[PDB]
């Protein structure tokens, strides 16, 4: 369940949510199994025989990376200062860039605008994602600190954006057998299809899922104070996790 790409150093950065790693010996039996988050860097490739006690993958737990698959130039689409982002200059490091705010922070001027980053070439035209047809742009979510200003070239494996972040015993068995709903359950993908958002009026956010070749309409409501581990450009699978829990 892996969908990854090689970076500049030759290492592999994974862009799939459900990537699983396993150790299989020469007799063909699994011995160890591990889970890999979104954006981990692999020391060894798939099928490469390894020895014992060697690290094989590293990642950042404190921040989710929004990583671009293609290499080229970044242009800030729907980028209006004072309504979508803010300009902050640090006092110690001196190495700062734009900070993207959110609807609960920006005024009504930015509530009708969706700041995003688009990927182009040196020729100024869209660099379509290989194998697909839609242009390569990514909508910046709130509280994301832009690091690379306009006119800074990128490549696959670059942090195009960075998003900072049981009982046990007899009662656990009793709750399992009584089928009690957990306090804050995980949100699952009701149906498989490309995802999108709606209007976040009042105290909720709206998700929309549309199958590529099925019955298009389907929407859900979410308490907007809940973290999502999905992007607006990705198509999901039925039963997949949309929120952790």
């Amino acid at each position: 369940n892996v969908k990854s790409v090689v970076n500049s150093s030759g290492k592999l950065v994974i862009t799939s949510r459900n990537t699983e790693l396993k150790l299989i010996d020469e007799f063909g039996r699994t011995k160890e199994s591990y889970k890999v988050p979104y954006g981990a860097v692999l020391a060894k490739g798939d099928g490469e025989q390894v020895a014992g006690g060697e690290t094989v993958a590293n990642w950042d737990p404190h921040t989710m990376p929004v990583i671009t698959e293609v290499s080229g130039f970044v242009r800030f689409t729907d980028m209006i200062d004072g309504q979508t982002i803010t300009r902050q200059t640090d006092e110690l490091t001196g190495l700062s860039s734009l900070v993207v705010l959110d609807s609960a922070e920006r005024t009504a001027g930015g509530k009708d605008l969706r700041p995003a980053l688009k990927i182009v070439d040196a020729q100024g035209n869209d660099v379509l994602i290989p194998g697909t047809d839609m242009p390569a742009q990514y909508f910046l979510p709130g509280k994301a600190i832009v690091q690379l200003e306009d006119g800074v070239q990128i490549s696959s494996g670059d942090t195009l954006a960075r998003i900072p972040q049981i009982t046990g015993g007899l009662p656990r068995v009793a709750d399992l057998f009584e089928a009690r709903r957990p306090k804050e359950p995980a949100i699952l993908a009701e149906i498989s299809g490309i995802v999108s958002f709606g209007k976040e009026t009042k105290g909720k956010r709206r998700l929309v899922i549309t199958p590529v070749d099925g019955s298009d309409p389907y929407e859900e409501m979410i308490p907007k104070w809940r973290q999502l581990n999905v992007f607006e450009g990705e198509r999901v699978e039925r039963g997949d996790v949309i929120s952790d829990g």
Partner: protein, 50 residues
Amino acid sequence: TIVNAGSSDFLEGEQVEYSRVKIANRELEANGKVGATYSRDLLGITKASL
């Protein structure tokens, strides 16, 4: 729980026994008709035993 009663006797949103639905569908399949489509339910042991 029934979702589309088909040619059966059940209702639109009635809760029934799964084995009864199986028997009814087995009977209706022998008369060249259409049975009822259903969805399974999960109940707790206290709720299932009452």
